[PDB]
Design a protein around this ligand. Sequence first.
Ligand SMILES: CCCCCCCCCCCCCCCCC(=O)O
Length: 133
Amino acid sequence: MVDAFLGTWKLVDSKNFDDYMKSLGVGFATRQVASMTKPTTIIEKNGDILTLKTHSTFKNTEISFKLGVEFDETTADDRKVKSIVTLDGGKLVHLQKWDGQETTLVRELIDGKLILTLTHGTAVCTRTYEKEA
Ligand SMILES: CCCCCCCCCCCCCCCCC(=O)O
């Protein structure tokens, strides 16, 4: 039920990503490069399994998961977390847990754009991705 999220997407706007990274304890030099990086996110499905690739000139990541089933993840900033992804209100909600901390990565489609909202602590970052053909 994930289907309009599938495809290749490019970052075209970012708000408050430095705040989000700093909340996670990312160091200034990494935040600095990250603030100038425009990733490509690729979301594909094969049956019940989603694979989400994030590619850039700085960091790359890839995760595979089934909706609603917890998976181990090692994030771009090297946190080892317990993750689960679901659909909630038509939004793809990714919850990460570690050390009693939590962060959510929420994706929603608004006027054909994918809006990624990243929340940790009080920090709320909004990143906008546009679909590639
Ligand atoms: C893999 C490319 C991610 C962007 C540059 C590196 C950022 C480091 C801080 C990582 C924080 C947790 C992941 C954020 C993902 C942001 C996104 O998918 O747009």
